[PDB]
């Protein structure tokens, strides 16, 4: 009972922290007019996705940690729900990274690429892809298509209902690997651009405000994307690596339950850590946060 109790406590604490941080970000963007733009719109969409993860995905994952005898398809649907919510969070983060890449490396077309309803279109595409990938097991690609309980009912654990081939070849590659590679490429491009600008400017004392602004924006974006990529990888890679070596290592010792709990809580900590750290990197966000806190008190 001790392990289950501590796991549930950690999961609920993560959910509450994600809820608080993301509602704070949304409140700050709603209040300040100087915070209302496309990048903050993507940040708010990611924050809402993380709110959904904390309210729904985390309690649902706790529900699949029980193992009580229940219908196979209901628990398959719950697992697909948590999958869809995590997909939405990851795709919103990728959208923010793409917005930063367009802003930094494509300044002239930026107003013509992401402004207007195109941001809503991109968010809708992210959610559609999330639902499509997360609801593929419901099309018959599942184990129930095996006698923990019997006659349709099973012990509701994630691996009992969700096949591993989908989790490795499909979920790990398209959802956790491809966005990670894209974010790494964007970070590398912005880092190289920033260091090229710095090397160009270092020869001259007293540079123009134009060059100073360019270097400032490039460095800030590069460090923000470094933080984003590092946190995303640290949170998501362990669990999917565990899945990969469960699928590829036959009869090898299945990961001890504490390791599985740690991987799950890290994957959920992704949703609370992003994009609050990114928001705190901007002076306006933290100024608004402090003003709201002072007004409340």
């Amino acid at each position, epitope marked *: 009972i001790m392990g289950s109790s501590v796991y549930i406590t950690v999961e609920l604490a993560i959910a509450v922290l994600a809820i608080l941080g993301n509602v704070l970000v949304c409140w700050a963007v709603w209040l300040n007019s100087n915070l209302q733009n496309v990048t903050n719109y993507f940040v708010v969409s990611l924050a809402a996705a993380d709110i959904a993860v904390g309210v729904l995905a985390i309690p649902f994952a706790i529900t699949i940690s029980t193992g009580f005898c229940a219908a196979c398809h209901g628990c398959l649907a719950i697992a697909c729900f948590v999958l869809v919510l995590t997909q939405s969070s990851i795709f919103s983060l990728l959208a923010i990274a793409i917005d930063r890449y367009i802003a930094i490396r494509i300044p002239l077309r930026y107003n013509g690429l992401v402004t207007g309803t195109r941001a809503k279109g991109i968010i809708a595409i992210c959610w559609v892809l999330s639902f499509a990938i997360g609801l593929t097991p419901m099309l018959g690609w599942n184990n129930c298509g095996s006698q923990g309980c019997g006659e349709g009912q099973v012990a509701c654990l994630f691996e009992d209902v969700v096949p591993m081939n989908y989790m490795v070849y499909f979920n790990f590659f398209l959802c956790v690997l491809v966005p990670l590679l894209l974010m790494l490429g964007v970070y590398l491009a912005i880092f190289l651009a920033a260091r090229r600008q710095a090397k*160009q400017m270092e*020869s*001259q*004392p*007293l*540079p*123009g*405000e*134009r*060059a*100073r602004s*360019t270097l400032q924006k490039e460095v800030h974006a590069a460090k923000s994307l470094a933080i984003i990529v590092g946190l995303f990888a640290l949170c998501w890679l362990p669990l999917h690596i565990i899945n990969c070596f469960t699928f590829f290592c036959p009869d090898c010792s299945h990961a001890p339950l504490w390791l599985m709990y740690a991987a799950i809580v890290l994957s959920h900590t992704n949703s609370v850590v992003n994009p609050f750290i990114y928001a705190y990197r901007i002076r306006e966000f933290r100024q608004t946060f402090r003003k709201i806190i002072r007004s409340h008190v």
Partner: antibody
């Protein structure tokens, strides 16, 4: 149309000081640094220094440090140089230029008309 | 610092004649600028970044050079081109100009 309007001629006696003006127009004044060039006796172009109108940063030629002080009026979009403790050596023609940034390098884009400062008792 | 020495100091050229004037740097320089000044008037940017003609500069003017030696050339001399030309450096501060080359029209 980027233009730099300088002051008028100044005849002063040794020991006095003058403040040359440079009125900018046609471009965002704070975006590019302003530099001052002295031409003495003809065919002798000397770089005095530059000032960033955005934050007031300055870089002077060590030859003219203490002789020339660069100030800026962001509201009025003008740049000033003060030539203190004038002697006959300082009698020359002084220009103000705009240091444009091409995203690849820097160069003096627009030059002022120039001001003739003659110092003698 | 760095020293810019231009050659020839004084030169005359008939109209239509190809004219090349050089600018020697004491140490290596990355870029060289060129300014044309006529008597009684302020200097005007002519060539920037060692090859690029400024606005309003005729295509007959060309810029070249790297490291120690730099030069500009005129494909065919015109009467409008009789002036003084200065080369500027901004690699190692302070900025240094050249002594200039007075270009005269042969008659």
């Amino acid at each position: 149309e980027v233009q730099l309007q300088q002051s008028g001629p100044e005849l002063v006696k040794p020991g006095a000081s003058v403040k040359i003006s440079c009125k900018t127009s046609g471009y965002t004044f704070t975006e590019f640094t302003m530099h001052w060039v002295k031409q003495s006796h003809g065919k002798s172009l000397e770089w005095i220094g530059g000032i960033d109108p955005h934050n007031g940063d300055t870089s002077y030629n060590q030859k003219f440090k203490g002789k020339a002080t660069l100030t800026v009026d962001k509201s009025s979009s003008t740049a000033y140089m003060d030539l203190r403790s004038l002697t006959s050596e300082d009698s020359a023609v002084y220009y103000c230029t705009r240091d444009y940034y091409d995203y690849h390098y820097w160069y003096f884009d627009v030059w002022g008309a120039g001001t003739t400062v003659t110092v003698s008792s | 610092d760095i020293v810019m020495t231009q050659s020839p100091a004084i030169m005359s050229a008939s109209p239509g004649e190809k004219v090349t004037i050089t600018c020697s740097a004491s140490s290596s320089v990355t870029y060289m600028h060129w300014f044309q000044q006529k008597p009684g008037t302020s200097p005007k940017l002519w060539i920037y970044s060692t090859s690029n003609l400024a606005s309003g500069v005729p295509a007959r003017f060309s810029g070249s050079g790297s490291g120690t030696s730099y030069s500009l050339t005129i494909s065919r001399m015109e009467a409008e081109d009789a002036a003084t030309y200065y080369c500027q450096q901004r690699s190692t501060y302070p900025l240094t100009f050249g002594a200039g080359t007075k270009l005269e029209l042969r008659r």
